[PDB]
Amino acid sequence: AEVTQLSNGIVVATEHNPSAHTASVGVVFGSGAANENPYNNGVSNLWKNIFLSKENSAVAAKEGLALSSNISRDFQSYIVSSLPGSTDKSLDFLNQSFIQQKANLLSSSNFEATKKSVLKQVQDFEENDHPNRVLEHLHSTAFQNTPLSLPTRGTLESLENLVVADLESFANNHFLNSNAVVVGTGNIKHEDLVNSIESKNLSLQTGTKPVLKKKAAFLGSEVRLRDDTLPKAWISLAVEGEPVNSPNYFVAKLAAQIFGSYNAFEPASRLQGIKLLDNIQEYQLCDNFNHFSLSYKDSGLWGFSTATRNVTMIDDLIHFTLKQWNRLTISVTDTEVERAKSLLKLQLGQLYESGNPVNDANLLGAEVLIKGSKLSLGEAFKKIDAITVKDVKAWAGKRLWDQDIAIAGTGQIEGLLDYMRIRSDMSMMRW
Amino acid sequence: WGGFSVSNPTIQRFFALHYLVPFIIAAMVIMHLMALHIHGSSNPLGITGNLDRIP
Numbered sequence: 415a416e417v418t419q420l421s422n423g424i425v426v427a428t429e430h431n432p433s434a435h436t437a438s439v440g441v442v443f444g445s446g447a448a449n450e451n452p453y454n455n456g457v458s459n460l461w462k463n464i465f466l467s468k469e470n471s472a473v474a475a476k477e478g479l480a481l482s483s484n485i486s487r488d489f490q491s492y493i494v495s496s497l498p499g500s501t502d503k504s505l506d507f508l509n510q511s512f513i514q515q516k517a518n519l520l521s522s523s524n525f526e527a528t529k530k531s532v533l534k535q536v537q538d539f540e541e542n543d544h545p546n547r548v549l550e551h552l553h554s555t556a557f558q559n560t561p562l563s564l565p566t567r568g569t570l571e572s573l574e575n576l577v578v579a580d581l582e583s584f585a586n587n588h589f590l591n592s593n594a595v596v597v598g599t600g601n602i603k604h605e606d607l608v609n610s611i612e613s614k615n616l617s618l619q620t621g622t623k624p625v626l627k628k629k630a631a632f633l634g635s636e637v638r639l640r641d642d643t644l645p646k647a648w649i650s651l652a653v654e655g656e657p658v659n660s661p662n663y664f665v666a667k668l669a670a671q672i673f674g675s676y677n678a679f680e681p682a683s684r685l686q687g688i689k690l691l692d693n694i695q696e697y698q699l700c701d702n703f704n705h706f707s708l709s710y711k712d713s714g715l716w717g718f719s720t721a722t723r724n725v726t727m728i729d730d731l732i733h734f735t736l737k738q739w740n741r742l743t744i745s746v747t748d749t750e751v752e753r754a755k756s757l758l759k760l761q762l763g764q765l766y767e768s769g770n771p772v773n774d775a776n777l778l779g780a781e782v783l784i785k786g787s788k789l790s791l792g793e794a795f796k797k798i799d800a801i802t803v804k805d806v807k808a809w810a811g812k813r814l815w816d817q818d819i820a821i822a823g824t825g826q827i828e829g830l831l832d833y834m835r836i837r838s839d840m841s842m843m844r845w
Numbered sequence: 846w847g848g849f850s851v852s853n854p855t856i857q858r859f860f861a862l863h864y865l866v867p868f869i870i871a872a873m874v875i876m877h878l879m880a881l882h883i884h885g886s887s888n889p890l891g892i893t894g895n896l897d898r899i900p
């Protein structure tokens with residue numbers, strides 16, 4: 415297992431695996447939804463569905479290729495997959511359809527049909543997908559009036575004002591050679607890829623991207639979307655967390671692993687070594703929860719999400735969870751830290767060593783764009799093993815004890831108390 | 846009076862009654878707070894308060 419970075423004008427990164435049976439080749443750009451403004455929000459999500467449109471997918475399918483695309487807050491990628499003997503055809507398809515010609519894809523008949531399909535997807539997301547849209551509303555209230563607040567899909571109000579000239583204006587500012595990384599994963603050797611690119615003279619455009627002026631900033635706030643005709647309540651809560659390239663990046667992920675995830679209907683999930691589960695199962699305070707530690711280029715979020723049918727005891731669920739977060743400053747034990755070390759290593763090993771080269775192409779390109787290289791899994795395991803109890807207590811005294819929070823919620827949330835009752839539970843008046 | 850005018854038995858029985866009636870008042874205040882717990886308080890607009898409550 416080894417990565418190889420090489421620059422000749424174009425940054426080329428590979429990750430060779432001679433045991434895999436497919437190969438994957440694409441390009442990742444270093445702009446996401448946090449490089450848009452409130453008037454062209456959704457222009458990245460439209461460029462994805464233009465690339466995945468029917469006439470473009472049909473040209474690829476006669477060659478034997480498949481297409482993927484992903485939109486995030488800091489990056490976006492466009493990936494072609496094939497059998498290991500036809501990576502030259504997949505690199506040709508990325509040259510013709512995406513680099514040279516774009517007036518074929520941006521015809522008026524293709525643009526209006528794609529815009530209709532995207533507007534239906536965003537409408538069905540806002541009406542049916544309740545856990546993921548509460549987490550989207552948590553980002554917009556915590557980073558309000560700041561580039562990290564814009565949703566990755568766009569809104570229905572901002573998507574209908576978009577024309578063809580808005581997509582060409584975004585492509586001239588961000589789809590550049592100094593913003594791009596060419597990636598290759600699966601069964602493909604590194605020097606075979608750099609000689610196929612150098613046998614041509616690929617270059618997107620010369621110049622740099624615009625520089626935004628407002629930096630990300632956390633603000634303690636809340637947003638409530640009450641809907642009494644829904645059968646549950648869905649709540650997210652977080653503090654300000656760690657960015658990428660932070661010295662406390664792995665300590666924050668281990669602290670979330672201490673409290674973990676839960677499913678009340680799976681019998682083995684009920685037997686986990688988490689002390690919070692004693693209070694919750696006595697009166698059945700929720701159906702599921704999960705803790706997270708998200709990281710971006712400038713900021714991050716640390717907290718949990720939950721879903722509940724017990725709508726008269728919502729205040730007991732928030733109170734018991736926040737009293738366990740107080741113990742990370744005061745009285746976290748050594749056996750809880752050793753359990754979280756083994757489970758964080760199992761979770762990280764499953765994320766980076768799945769058998770999908772499309773997942774590996776997204777992870778490799780996003781990390782080379784920020785850091786310039788990639789940290790191996792062997793070196794990440796040695797940083798996790800060196801964390802002590804005193805590292806956890808010093809991190810939680812800075813980020814958790816007596817700090818501001820952000821709350822989002824939907825459904826039957828009448829039993830959720832107001833902000834200052836929840837804010838005062840971030841300290842004990844004992845220590 | 847305990848007699849024919851305001852005199853010594855009148856003042857002695859008035860002090861003993863004065864000790865007792867504040868304890869009857871304290872029991873009526875408890876019955877007053879029980880009836881208030883059933884319906885809650887009103888508000889200066891005169892209309893229902895069930896839509897927006899704070900603890």
Ligand code: HEM
Pocket residue numbers: 874877881885886887888
């Ligand atoms: C020692 C005497 C008393 C005590 C300790 C007491 C106590 C209270 C308290 C704590 C409340 C709730 C808060 C408030 O609305 O101010 C209340 C409400 C109320 N009290 Fe009293 N009270 C006393 C005497 C009286 C008297 C003399 C009356 C009327 C003749 C009265 C009639 C009411 C009413 C109608 C309410 C409801 C007000 C509303 O909901 O808008 N109380 N009382």
